[PDB]
Write a protein that binds this ligand. Structure first.
Ligand SMILES: COc1cc(/C=N/n2c(SC)nnc2-c2ccccc2)c(Br)cc1O
Ligand code: NA
Length: 334
């Protein structure tokens, strides 16, 4: 009475059909650049796994971003490097420019192209309906590409989407939680930011796939169009699913649990309670209505589904009428 298995609807066997060297990152041998090409300029941020700096390549005066890794097992480092190398050149995928050994920490430092990212407060006060559709389409191009390349991102969230708005430029960053998809594999559910975790994670269903990313993207869409970031604000992982259930309802949650024969802690049912499915229109107000259309709500509804198998793929999402004006704009002679 374990759960029912699951496999991706699309891109199921991408890695099955590639040479072992493509996905066997433990066998990757790093070739190191020269740290002395780069001078750190300003610390940007501190995380659990890395410290991030703006830097200059002193041989050409170009800005770059350096992520100095905290000490961790080679295998994790090799996984992120391999993924970044595999995906390099893909649409809106951050470009890994170099890999060096930091001369102070003696840990690897990943050197990326620089994105002049627009501060949050400004984007929040100025993004139009069209801007949201455009950037959503550009994220989807990155996700379709990485999924088609056999990789799940597993940390889609606003902080990992860099936007240089004056150049209409976006990059999906932080590939440190990314992993190769292999059908039938049980993955670690301790991925993604609390607020962007899919229901599969929250009920400990380990045989997930690319569709996790599409849940996370739907949480981003709702936060953007309804002007509430994060949209589903739980105080821990259990309460995260409660906050989802208060919107999607408990009927469809229990139908999902039943479909996959998922067992919940009796206390979990308790806090989940019983909730009607709410209309998306309930979240529309005078301060966000300019960003909301029936197309946006129809699209959001097809991303934010309990059942991972029933979510749109990235390519299906790109064909949604919500993006018709973006597709037109981009159909250019050049
Ligand atoms: C953490 O993984 C990554 C971070 C960044 C940059 N991050 N970042 C920037 S890029 C110009 N600007 N602010 C931050 C930032 C990072 C961590 C905490 C706070 C801010 C890049 Br290019 C690639 C990564 O794989
Ligand atoms: Na240096």
């Amino acid at each position: 009475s374990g759960p029912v298995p699951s496999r991706a609807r699309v891109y199921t066997d991408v890695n099955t059909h590639r040479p072992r060297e493509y996905w066997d990152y433990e066998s990757h041998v790093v070739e190191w650049g020269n740290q002395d090409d780069y001078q750190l300029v300003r610390k940007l941020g501190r995380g659990k796994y890395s410290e991030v700096f703006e830097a200059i390549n002193i041989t050409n005066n170009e800005k770059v971003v350096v992520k100095i890794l905290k000490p961790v097992k080679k295998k994790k480092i090799k996984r992120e490097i391999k993924i970044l190398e595999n995906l390099r050149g893909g649409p809106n995928i951050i470009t890994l420019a170099d890999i060096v050994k930091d001369p102070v920490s003696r840990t690897p430092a990943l050197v990326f192209e620089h994105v002049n990212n627009t501060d949050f407060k400004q984007l929040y006060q100025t993004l139009t309906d069209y801007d949201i559709r455009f950037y959503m389409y550009e994220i989807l191009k990155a996700l379709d590409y990485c999924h088609s390349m056999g990789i799940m991102h597993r940390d889609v969230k606003p902080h990992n989407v860099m936007i240089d708005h004056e150049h209409r430029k976006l990059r999906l960053i932080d590939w440190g939680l990314a992993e190769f998809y292999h059908p039938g594999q049980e993955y670690n559910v301790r991925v993604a930011s609390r607020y962007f975790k899919g229901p599969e994670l929250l009920v400990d269903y380990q045989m997930y796939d690319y569709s996790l990313d599409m849940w996370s993207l739907g949480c981003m869409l709702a936060s953007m169009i309804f002007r509430k970031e994060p949209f589903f604000h739980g105080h821990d992982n259990y309460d995260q699913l409660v906050r989802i259930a208060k919107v999607l309802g408990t009927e469809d949650l229990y139908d999902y649990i039943d479909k996959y024969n998922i067992e919940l802690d009796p206390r979990f049912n308790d806090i989940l309670g019983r909730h009607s499915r709410k209309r998306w229109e309930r979240f529309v107000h005078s301060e966000n209505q300019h960003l909301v259309s029936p197309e946006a709500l129809d699209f959001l509804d097809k991303l934010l589904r309990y059942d991972h198998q029933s979510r749109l793929t990235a390519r299906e999402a790109m064909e949604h009428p919500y993006f018709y004006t973006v597709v037109k704009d981009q159909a250019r002679m050049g």
